[PDB]
Design a binder for this molecule. Sequence first.
Ligand code: ADP
Ligand code: ADP
Ligand code: ADP
Ligand code: MG
Ligand code: MG
Ligand code: MG
Lengths: 370, 370, 370, 159, 159
Amino acid sequence: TTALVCDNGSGLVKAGFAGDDAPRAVFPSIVGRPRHQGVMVGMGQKDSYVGDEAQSKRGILTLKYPIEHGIITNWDDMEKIWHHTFYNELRVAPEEHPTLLTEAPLNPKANREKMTQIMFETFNVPAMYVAIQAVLSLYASGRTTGIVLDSGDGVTHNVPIYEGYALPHAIMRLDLAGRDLTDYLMKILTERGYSFVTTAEREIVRDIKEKLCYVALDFENEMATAASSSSLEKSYELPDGQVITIGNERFRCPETLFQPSFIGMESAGIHETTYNSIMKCDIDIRKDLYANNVMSGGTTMYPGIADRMQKEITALAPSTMKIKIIAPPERKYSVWIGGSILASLSTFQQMWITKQEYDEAGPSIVHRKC
Amino acid sequence: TTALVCDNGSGLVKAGFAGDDAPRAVFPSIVGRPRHQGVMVGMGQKDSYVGDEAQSKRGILTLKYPIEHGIITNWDDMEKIWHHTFYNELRVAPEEHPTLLTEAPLNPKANREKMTQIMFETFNVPAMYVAIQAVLSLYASGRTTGIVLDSGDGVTHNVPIYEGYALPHAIMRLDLAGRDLTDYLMKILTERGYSFVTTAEREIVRDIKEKLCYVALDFENEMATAASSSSLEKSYELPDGQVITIGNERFRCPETLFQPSFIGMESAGIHETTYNSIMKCDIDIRKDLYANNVMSGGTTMYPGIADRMQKEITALAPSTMKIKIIAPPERKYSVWIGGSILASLSTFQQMWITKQEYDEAGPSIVHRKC
Amino acid sequence: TTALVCDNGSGLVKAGFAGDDAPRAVFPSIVGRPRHQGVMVGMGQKDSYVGDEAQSKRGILTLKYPIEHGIITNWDDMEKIWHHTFYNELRVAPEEHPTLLTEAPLNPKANREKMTQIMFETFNVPAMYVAIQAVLSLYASGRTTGIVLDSGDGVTHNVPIYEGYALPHAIMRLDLAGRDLTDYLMKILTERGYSFVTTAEREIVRDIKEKLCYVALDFENEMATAASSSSLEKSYELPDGQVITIGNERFRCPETLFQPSFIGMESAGIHETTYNSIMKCDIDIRKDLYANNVMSGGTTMYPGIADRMQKEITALAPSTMKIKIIAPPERKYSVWIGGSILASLSTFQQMWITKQEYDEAGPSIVHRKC
Amino acid sequence: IQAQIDIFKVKWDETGNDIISLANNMCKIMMSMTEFTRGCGPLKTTMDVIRAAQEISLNGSKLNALARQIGEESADSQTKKDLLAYLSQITLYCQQLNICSKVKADVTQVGALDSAMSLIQTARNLLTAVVQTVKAAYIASTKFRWRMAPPKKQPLIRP
Amino acid sequence: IQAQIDIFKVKWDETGNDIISLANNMCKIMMSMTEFTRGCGPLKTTMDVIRAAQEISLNGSKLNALARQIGEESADSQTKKDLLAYLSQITLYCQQLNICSKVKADVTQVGALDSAMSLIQTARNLLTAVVQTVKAAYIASTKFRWRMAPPKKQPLIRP
Ligand SMILES: Nc1ncnc2c1ncn2[C@@H]1O[C@H](COP(=O)(O)OP(=O)(O)O)[C@@H](O)[C@H]1O
Ligand SMILES: Nc1ncnc2c1ncn2[C@@H]1O[C@H](COP(=O)(O)OP(=O)(O)O)[C@@H](O)[C@H]1O
Ligand SMILES: Nc1ncnc2c1ncn2[C@@H]1O[C@H](COP(=O)(O)OP(=O)(O)O)[C@@H](O)[C@H]1O
Ligand SMILES: [Mg+2]
Ligand SMILES: [Mg+2]
Ligand SMILES: [Mg+2]
């Protein structure tokens, strides 16, 4: 039949049908459960709200993400999320569709083994496949030679590829991503007086970060400009009518990516991580990797991240090489479009993990096949 | 029909048609095989890249020369190289063309026997012939009386000839050639800080050697000049934008030829080898051999090797005799031009090893005919 | 007076007095600098902790090794390390003791020139000498004829010696050593779920590698045994009370030495490197080099490396020759014991680089003397 | 890339003309898009570049089918394996061109040059994998049991 | 090695007896350690082998001093240069024996045959460099301006 492509990220679930060019279902990956006391009979029978129905009712729920840093910490909640995706959002019986799941590199092996076991034993899919996300982003970028920075909500990882041959020793996975930026924005928002503490208020702060925050080209000059004048202050209106105003927190939140010492992490920024991943590859392909820096994932959509990253890498690379960062306008959905390209290929249809193979070899077949 | 002339050297393959004056195909004699992991479906179906397509993709390959010191160590790879040469580069069916192969002197007999067997059983050529390389260099030098120093990438050998009568007891084959100079250049490059370790980096060092290295007329004076001042330093730019700088390694790499004790070899330099080959010949022809020192092969193209070799031999020969080294500007292709001269001769067409003779006498006919 | 013997390795500094049989100071070669914020007045005045005082306080420091692959990348930090060694650990004024430093072969020349300049201008030693490490290991092994495999934390190099006459053309320096094994252990530890990312956590992983990791005699059989049963799993307790469990990562980390393709390196393992170094030597001494394979350095102390290396070499060497690997129980300190033997010799006291010679000839005297 | 086809002069000789015609159309569209990159060309709107990319993808599918027919007609050899590898590459590139063209069309409709840069890159990858498909197919069908001129003489001295 | 000393029969003739006695003691200890290697011998503990190695080192220092005295007594010649070379070798071997014996003692105290293998090897190197020191010293002191028998006849036919 037609294959499903479920890109269950750490923050958003993006599902669809293979061969298309856009997902059908795009909902947050949260599972709320009511915490207050129900007083009207018949209201309160539903124990847990999943996805978009827990984002509307978040005033009386404790939203809990099942996937946390790309690793599925809670498995019952993630079964709930997958059931929602298959039946209530896409409205397809899983028994008739192969499913192409995505996964960050360098995750635990139990993660793939349990995703395979759940798909083949609970949802009874006829076939499946687990693909690294940056490979799919390079599929959807229309190339075969690049270094794929793939931020997100859980992790931020690079995968350098030269002409279809990935270099597994130069894959650099960093655990700094959108959720850490949300928490840091909450922290620095406490300075102005605004205290967001609950989970629903985490979602409000996430929306503030998406709407207002941007990346400064030169950090010190922008701090000087923000301190000298109030030209950088922009106002946001909370769900209860209150108006906030953040002037200096706008570029301080996404600067955590380039200086992960803001949140106490030791590792180098994403620019030094990309450059170190480039100079771990063979000498002959560094020129081709410099010119194709595919950026993917949601977190790489801050206004001004491509220019800043080009400036930061150009100061590290030799003066001769041509650095240019590829930032497609649709880069939030690049992984899923790559899943559509991969799952609908004529060549690929011999690479599904069929149910018969899983019955023969158990959940450890995913390590051989994928 | 028209005969092929395939001069399969140890480092470069130079093929063409007899009667011409320049080869059609000149590509390195390497066979790369990918070593990394392929992640995009449909890319990676090709198991091995041969010649020029393995020199472009060398970033993800392990290049392996099948011919090593003039002796074909790997036979499947050399069948691959010959198939490439016949079909993909020259674009001729071998069944319709005699082939003139070349070979260094004093090689194993199994080498000729297996080249003959492969040509007559795998490529089905109608005739063939295996000719010593220095004889062909003397053909292409326009003379019939000289001593042919023929360096290269595998071996360095002399063949003294007087008026068409070669002296087989004065043939001096030395196993020091271009590849040993490349490895020594890598070794002495480690002193400055640059460490080239892989095979692709061997090719980068080979290019450094070709571009920059030269031969000093007086070694001690040049070392003194290089130590006193920085007038000898020249810079080279690596494929990833880095710039190197070699000042003293420029004439130390090709000095290995005149002092083979640099790389631990005992034998005498090429000047003493040529002089010893001259004074093994009959007394009456040494005057004619002194004045015709034909130099061939790629490795004899260092800037300043003719002057240095003339200075070194003149100090050994008697003060009366006239020493002059013949270094044609095209000496890299002298062996092949000699193959064109030999294979297109009217007299020569009775000396091919026809297929019927091979069927009668087996692969041991090449020892009688050649 | 009595000479110092400072064997400043890439991972550990081992100093002492010549003539002894054991070092006085053995501390890691790290220089930590605090990264958090100091809040108590008077605590935090010390800018950098060196050696053992930065290994105790590593919770709040960024440890940085000054020596990296046997080459001193940072010189101010290495002055700090030498000052620590001379004054705070050994407690000797350098002005009254000659110093015998050690160095891997095939390093840059600027390395020796700057070590000599720093010793003669900053520490004012009266004499010094820089000795290759494998020569000293052969001194301390009690022989004069062997091939010295000398692993470590920076490099892994061979030096074949026959009766006091080293063969400089058969010295094979490989840049795969203990630190690469630590990084690979971190990488493969990410599979089980444990993510060590910081420098202090590099030190924790190094301790895991030292305590638990071993070398398998037959890799495939051991992988089969580890997959079939849980008899190979051993547990380690982290500094915060957590317990980890590594079963299959125990022999996969040190297998990188025999298959350097695990970490993306092309070069051959240490067994093929030793065998290639043997068959680059003269034919008459290969029998004596086969029977004396002195192994030194810290990294050659994995349980079962001697048996595995003997099995791997015996499969390469001719069936007649007698292969036996010499692995003294003290081989971690073999280089320093060799320094004690060399520096305290009656014959050697004319080979120091005296201060007057350095004043006459500058820092380029170390190339003539050593 | 154009020169490799331009040395063609007039199994193979039955389906050869179709393949050479398809490759020539591909090269014509390719330099159309290249001239768009340089600024002056037949097509000036990004929508035109997307249409050209879809056209190249269709031609790629047709040429893939023809070359597969020739490949299974021919006999076992090394050039057959090269041909099959290049066919797989063409399949991947065609799928990329289709889906990426649709995505860029939607992105442009929802409301510049960099939008067409990746389409040009993918079409150029496709074209490079075609001129190696016509040559491999020609050799596999002919030399084993149109025309291509013998290669030009290599220079004796390279300045 | 024993045979080279055994052909000695009774400057030189003043310090010759001391040197021949020291060399004989060296050979006796050497085959003591060799018999330890073969399994049966006077000394059976690795500590005993370390003590024997230290004893051989002490004898080596004494013989080195005596041979140096003879060497400076004698006149310039080629055998004098050979003698000085062998003296340098003896110095190196004695230093190795001292330090390695101390190291093996500590290793054994902190808690087998291979521990004594290297000590036996170094002592055997030392002994080989002594029987060439007594001969060179004897020739330099005597033949230039005890006894050694003339060498035995070489076989005419070697089967
Ligand atoms: N326009 C935007 N600007 C800045 N950050 C964004 C934007 N859109 C999304 N994000 C961040 O990206 C995250 C979503 O990333 P996503 O594409 O879902 O990655 P994944 O699918 O791997 O979870 C959100 O948590 C949010 O913080
Ligand atoms: N211009 C040059 N200067 C110095 N060395 C060269 C030059 N050109 C080629 N070489 C050396 O010569 C080798 C090629 O020799 P070649 O003519 O191919 O001999 P053969 O055909 O017998 O292999 C190369 O390996 C290279 O090291
Ligand atoms: N018992 C052991 N088992 C395995 N590896 C070890 C052991 N001890 C040390 N190592 C490794 O050896 C390294 C120390 O080597 P060292 O002797 O210091 O060499 P160098 O002095 O040249 O740095 C450490 O980094 C560690 O990884
Ligand atoms: Mg994502
Ligand atoms: Mg040649
Ligand atoms: Mg060491």
